[PDB]
Symmetry: C3
Subunit: 321 residues, 3 copies
């Protein structure tokens, strides 16, 4: 009967179209390179006021070289002119009543205890320690540098998909509405401008610059290079997204200590101890490109051939019911 | 004959079970994301004694920002109050008998030779050089900071599988036996506590803190995120492993030089030159997640269908022999 | 007819050979790990002359720890003995005629403007600013450190393919023609020596050390670990390639600012502001290993079986035409 091949032809038309669109949708004919090879060069610009001092890029950006992880210091605590010696720790956790509870068995991971119980102040009595004196008082409140909200982060990114040796940069003058020197990234108006406003990044990440600058934090500028290397070079394009990575028992925020080391004409040494709070920026470059390949195209082919060949049989069985 | 289909049915039962368990074992129905996207924030805590000085996190940890690669300095060599000028190098490799073997052709990659053969000491005669004087004597023996064994490394890690957009952190309060503030990672008792004892990491890596602190070294804290994103969020879990990466013609260990730069009231410049030996820690985050996908499930399906269809034929041929 | 099976046997011989060589060529029987896990330790050696000063590794290499991204400073601009205060900016872009165009609305991202229009010099009138005074004059010409061309970069690299747990290092004494201590990487004579001459790297990247040292730049030392883990351990070998990553509206080159902070006996603070130009080196380790697997071998098998089975039918149809 001729209707049998019009039923079979329809079987193949319909079934083969479902299978066809699915495999064509997932790019099953493409080999994929998910090991992007990226280089990130960052540049911060701006000047702020902290206390009655002005902070420039040499003062608040650390490290200075422009790596993929850098910190913009927004608030700090200074303990000036420390010197090696003996003094009573100011932390309440070091409370003592007598030298019998200032032995090495107490607070093993903390500072070096001399073994004497001394009077830090008239209201507290703490174990004495050997180290930089006086000790740090990290329980005071200090201001934050508000001008940092208007600083700009410039991200030059040069990536390469090695499986295909397809290397490209994220400086694209034609994709940007305004000139490179004056543009400013906006997810909608200018999504390819490499210059980001610090406050903007804080908003795209859903964060309040006040609380964030107060407690410090870790934000991620995510650069995604999802590319179809079957298409034009023009089509491999970076997409920027933003997220807070520290999120959240542990106290949120981000801070670290470093000192400025000075030496007296006498030769004695003394430092300024600095506890820094800021916003660490991690440039996270993901990417995966897909190029047509004979092997995945043959495997996907064989897969779709056999699957339709069985679907037509099963559909014949379902119809005859 | 009915036995022919009981032989064929057994063929399909047995053969299909082998193929089935194999493919089900390798998760052949799963697409895999092997391009994890991780952020690492580290925090070191502790205080040590070196010579008659106390070292805190601002003194022995470098860099300070808490990156994925940091160094805990255990032994150092100081050459204090250097100043630009001329002086005889102390390295024996620079031995000379006359100014005729102190020309630019000699030791091309070394320091800047003035061209004079001078008497460093009464027992050695070396080429004179222009640079920081006096020169460094890196052949002496110095102590090591033993308290560093009791320092703790706290690793906060926030990763994301971008192919699935599955982001998670390694701070898991319910997986830890004791509180976050006081726990301490143990591969068996508390394998999810993010706080590591430096000495412990040295042991998990099979290293002696004495020799390691003496020569310096490079250890790896490996965080592995092997996950089945078909299962619950609760099941994606990090696993910590440890290894020594410098291992091993070349002299083992790890050291680097940096200076503390001071300026005299006169305006002249002088530095303290420091050769630092310590333990560099590299946090190496690997991860790959697997999620069910239609394409790999169809390809694996077609693969198992055809393979059993041939195995039953071959087994029929083997039986009739 | 017997010729029908000699035509079919030839069909299978020919068709099966094409398919066979193709699949065998692409290692379709291999699972692939493209998430290499690498550790990089670098060491720079050399001494240069800048002005009438000598720069050693502690002076021009930053950071000092030997990370995968480091900088060799070739030219710098010093602005010595700055101090907080008020002074007229030297940038022409800050030209003013009256204090009415020195308000906060002008150059929002720049320095902190006091609101006064002052005379920087007799030929220029600029807005006054609060900050480090005097201001920087980054339009002068300064020398470059030429000895940096003869510096050597030593790269120790320790990688691991985690899917197979195959870890190896790039220190291979038998693959190098000369001893480790004295060899020098050459793409042809000694392509496994880990010691690179800075000038050499500049040439492999197609760059002129003069212009590059003048403007600074970003070069990549690419380490590739393409390996067949079916073969001997001896066969997994690193291959070094080189490229300039900054390439290229934006001014090329690479520079960053950092200060040396001094304090007077009076207690007042003053710094030396340094704009550094150099060559940043990014060690980029790519790698992917292939090991035989049952699943990819079965899938590729099924793929080739079905494809030949159809090719013989299509070829029969083409012949009978
Ligand atoms: C580490 O701390 C314990 C106390 O918890 C102490 O007994 C031990 O001596 C310390 N280790 C070193 C090397 O000082
Ligand atoms: C950049 O603009 C020019 C025209 O000004 C255009 O020809 C060029 O193709 C653009 N860049 C790309 C990748 O197309
Ligand atoms: C050096 O002088 C200062 C006072 O200027 C003094 O406090 C310090 O103890 C002296 N150093 C020594 C080792 O005496
Ligand atoms: C590099 O060293 C060689 C000696 O090995 C010397 O002749 C040459 O001038 C040096 N290059 C520079 C740029 O100084
Ligand atoms: C953490 O503990 C709470 C109960 O205290 C539990 O409900 C929660 O599910 C735990 N975390 C996870 C991922 O289950
Ligand atoms: C500055 O003074 C010191 C002694 O305090 C002296 O050694 C040095 O040479 C002087 N600098 C100059 C340029 O004379
Ligand atoms: C940012 O700059 C604008 C001028 O462009 C200014 O009005 C605004 O106050 C600045 N923001 C902060 C937080 O100072
Ligand atoms: C290094 O050289 C020795 C012989 O001196 C040789 O036996 C060894 O196999 C070489 N290394 C490798 C990976 O073969
Ligand atoms: C400290 O002394 C210097 C001169 O040596 C002077 O210029 C400076 O203004 C003084 N500091 C203060 C707060 O007066
Ligand atoms: Mg404290
Ligand atoms: Mg020496
Ligand atoms: Mg300027
Ligand atoms: Na298949």
């Amino acid at each position: 009967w001729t209707i049998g091949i019009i039923n079979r032809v329809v079987q193949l038309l319909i079934i083969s179209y479902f299978v066809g669109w699915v495999f064509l949708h997932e790019k099953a004919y493409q080999v994929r390179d998910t090991a992007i090879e990226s280089s990130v060069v960052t540049k911060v610009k701006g000047s702020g006021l902290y206390a009655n001092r002005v902070m420039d890029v040499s003062d608040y950006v650390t490290p200075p070289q422009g790596t993929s992880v850098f910190v913009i210091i927004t608030k700090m605590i200074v303990t000036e002119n420390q010197m090696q010696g003996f003094c009573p720790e100011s932390e309440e956790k070091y409370r003592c009543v007598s030298d019998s509870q200032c032995g090495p068995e107490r607070l093993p991971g903390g500072g070096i205890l001399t073994g004497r119980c001394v009077n830090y102040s008239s209201v507290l009595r703490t174990c004495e320690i050997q180290g930089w004196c006086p000790t740090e008082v990290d329980t005071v409140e200090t201001p934050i540098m508000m001008e940092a909200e208007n600083f700009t982060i410039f991200i030059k990114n040069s990536i390469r998909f090695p499986l295909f040796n397809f290397e490209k940069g994220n400086l694209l003058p034609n994709l940007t509405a305004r000139d490179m020197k004056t543009c400013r990234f906006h997810p909608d108006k200018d999504p390819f401008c490499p210059i980001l406003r610090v406050g903007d990044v804080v908003k795209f990440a859903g964060q309040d610059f006040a609380k964030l600058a107060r407690t410090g934090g870790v934000l991620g500028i995510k650069i995604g290079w999802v590319c179809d290397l079957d298409k034009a070079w023009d089509q491999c394009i970076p997409k920027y997204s933003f997220t807070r990575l520290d999120s959240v028992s542990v106290s949120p925020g981000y801070n670290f200590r470093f000192a400025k080391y000075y030496k007296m004409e006498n030769g004695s040494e003394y430092r300024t101890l600095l506890k820094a709070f800021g916003i660490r920026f991690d440039v996270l470059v993901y990417g995966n490109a897909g190029k047509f390949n004979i092997i995945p195209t043959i495997i996907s082919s064989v897969a779709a051939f056999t699957s339709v060949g069985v679907g037509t049989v099963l559909c014949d069985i379902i119809l005859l019911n």
